[PDB]
């Protein structure tokens, strides 16, 4: 009954932030977390070169990894990219070789346990009709070359992919989900940010929407026992920040953790309500509104222990491998007290 707990270690360029996040994991560490994924990515180049967040010969990477290893966890450095820079790279077979080589020397000069690839949209999808042109096959070739290489080193490969809902979403055609699922050990479907920073307010990851995404992914024929679902630790506070050139109201928002949301609702005396996404949403997502001292109306959507628990149940419905939440930086001591036991109940 043991499921995979992949935690994202978003310390960015701050060595102390990495340490502070580990220290926020209580009891026996392996009872809550299997893998930790640090975003040690500084910049990825056209030619496939890789630049990390600190100086060249820094001992930070080795020290942080031995730290996590001492706690019984495994480390999978997050390699994330997007946009034009990543499109040129994958197009070039030399640049693909180059990046993989940089990954190889990283896992050697760190003794890490593998890598989480996070190549996000925008990605070249070419013509809309043709579902097979663009960077799609070049991306697959990268994953297959990486998988072949790292598995020789007895290292793990996890790939974070965009949450596709249906066939009409042509801009996601870069992800050959079936072929990709065979080039990884785990497939992390990032089922969150259904509502984002400048969109209309709403649940960041509604219960029926996650199931909807996973149903599509299942339809592509991927092995669901290799799929890690996604869940947000953060919420969002939306306001109307103005107008566009055509007079249309524009939204903007700030992201925060579970604790901040509670303090907010308490400060303004707003009552929290579970927003049911539709008739197929039993528990729902917590939400509230308030008006600040400047007269601006705010709308908040976030996740508590109640909604988190309902969404984690999807692991049992689809027989998933586990969950990859984003991210530990959104968890403070108050949140951690109830969140980690909650994780242990579902991930055992």
Which residues in the 203-242 window bind Ca ion by CB under 5 A? none
Identify the CA nearest to 37 among candidates 5, 82, 15: 5
- Residue 8 partner contact from Cl ion, Ca ion, none using kind-dependent CB cut-offs of 5 to 8 Å: none
Distance, CA of 212 to CA of 189 (rounded, Å) = 12
Residue 122 has, within 13 A of its CA and on its CB side, a CA count of: 6
Distance, CA of 58 to CA of 23 (rounded, Å) = 22
Give yes or no for residue 125 binding Ca ion (CB under 5 A): yes
Give yes or no for residue 197 binding Cl ion (CB under 5 A): yes
Give 1 or 248: the residue with its C-beta nearer to Ca ion. Answer: 248
Distance, CA of 28 to CA of 15 (rounded, Å) = 23
DSSP H helical segments within the chain, as ranges?
15-22, 60-70, 83-91, 93-108, 136-150, 177-181, 207-219, 258-267, 305-312, 314-318, 333-347
Beta carbons of 187 and 181 less than 8 angstroms apart: yes
Give 156 or 204: the residue with its C-beta nearer to Cl ion. Answer: 204
Identify the CA nearest to 325 among candidates 249, 228, 216, 235: 228
Which residues in the 129-148 window bind Ca ion by CB under 5 A? 130-131, 133-134
**Per-residue contact string for residues 171-200; x = within reach of Ca ion by CB under 5 A:** --x---------------------------
- Residue 165 partner contact from Ca ion, Cl ion, none using kind-dependent CB cut-offs of 5 to 8 Å: none
**Per-residue contact string for residues 251-290; x = within reach of Cl ion by CB under 5 A:** ----x-----------------------------------
Point out the annotated binding site: 120, 125, 127, 130, 133, 173, 178, 248
Could you give the strand order of the β-sheet that contains 235-243, starting from the edge strand earlier in sequence? 249-256, 235-243, 297-301, 285-291, 273-275
- Residue 125 partner contact from Cl ion, Ca ion, none using kind-dependent CB cut-offs of 5 to 8 Å: Ca ion
Identify the CA nearest to 175 among candidates 201, 215, 142: 142
Distance, CA of 144 to CA of 203 (rounded, Å) = 35
Q: Least Å distance between CB 254 and Cl ion?
A: 6
**Per-residue contact string for residues 229-258; x = within reach of Cl ion by CB under 5 A:** --------------------------x---
Query: Which one of 40-48, 61-69, 193-201, 326-334 is the stretch in contact with Cl ion (CB under 5 A)?
Result: 193-201
Give yes or no for residue 330 binding Ca ion (CB under 5 A): no
Beta carbons of 103 and 158 less than 8 angstroms apart: no
Q: Total residues at the site for Ca ion (CB under 5 A)? A: 9
Q: Least Å distance between CB 207 and Cl ion?
A: 23
Q: Least Å distance between CB 120 and Ca ion?
A: 6
Query: Which one of 53-61, 82-90, 243-251, 288-296 is the stretch in contact with Ca ion (CB under 5 A)?
Result: 243-251
Give yes or no for residue 45 binding Ca ion (CB under 5 A): no
Distance, CA of 309 to CA of 236 (rounded, Å) = 19
- Cis? peptide before 186, omega within 30° of 0: no
Distance, CA of 35 to CA of 74 (rounded, Å) = 5
Give yes or no for residue 8 binding Ca ion (CB under 5 A): no
- Residue 133 partner contact from Ca ion, Cl ion, none using kind-dependent CB cut-offs of 5 to 8 Å: Ca ion
- Residue 124 partner contact from Ca ion, Cl ion, none using kind-dependent CB cut-offs of 5 to 8 Å: none
Look-up of token digits 């199931």: 211
Give 192 or 288: the residue with its C-beta nearer to Ca ion. Answer: 192
Residues that bind Ca ion (CB under 5 A): 125-126, 130-131, 133-134, 173, 247-248
Interface residues toward Cl ion, by CB under 5 A: 197, 255
């Amino acid at each position: 009954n043991a499921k995979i707990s992949l935690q994202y270690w978003d310390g960015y360029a701050s060595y102390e932030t990495y340490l502070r996040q580990l220290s926020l994991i209580p009891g026996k560490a392996t009872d809550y977390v299997d893998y930790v994924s640090p975003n040690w990515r500084g910049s990825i180049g056209t030619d496939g070169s890789l630049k990390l967040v600190w100086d060249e010969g820094s001992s930070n990477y080795k020290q942080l990894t031995n730290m996590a290893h001492g706690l019984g966890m495994k480390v999978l450095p997050l390699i994330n990219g997007s946009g034009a820079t990543l499109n040129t790279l994958l197009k070039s077979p030399a640049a693909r070789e180059k990046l993989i080589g940089e990954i190889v020397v990283l896992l050697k000069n760190t003794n890490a346990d593998g890598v989480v690839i996070d190549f996000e949209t925008p990605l070249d999808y070419g013509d809309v009709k043709d579902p097979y042109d663009g960077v799609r096959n070049d991306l697959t070739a990268f994953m297959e070359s990486l998988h072949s290489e790292l598995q020789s080193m007895n290292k793990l490969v996890v790939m974070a992919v965009m949450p596709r809902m249906s066939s009409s979403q042509y801009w996601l055609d870069a992800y050959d989900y079936e072929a990709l699922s065979h080039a990884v050990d785990y497939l992390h479907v990032m089922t969150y940010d259904h509502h984002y920073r400048t969109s209309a307010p709403g649940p960041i990851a509604p219960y029926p929407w996650i199931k909807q995404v996973l149903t599509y992914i299942q339809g592509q024929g991927v092995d669901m026992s290799k799929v890690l679902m996604g869940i947000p630790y953060y919420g969002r506070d939306w306001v109307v920040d103005g107008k566009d050139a055509n007079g249309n109201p524009t939204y903007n928002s700030t992201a925060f953790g579970y604790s901040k949301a509670l303090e907010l609702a308490d400060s303004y005396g707003a009552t929290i309500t579970y927003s049911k996404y539709n008739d197929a949403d039993p528990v729902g997502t917590p939400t509230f509104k308030y008006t600040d001292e400047k007269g601006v109306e705010h709308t908040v959507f976030f996740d508590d222990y109640t909604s988190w628990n309902a969404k984690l149940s999807i692991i049992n419905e689809f027989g998933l491998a586990g969950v990859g939440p984003w991210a530990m930086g959104w968890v403070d001591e108050n949140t951690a007290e109830g969140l980690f036991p909650l994780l242990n109940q579902h991930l055992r």
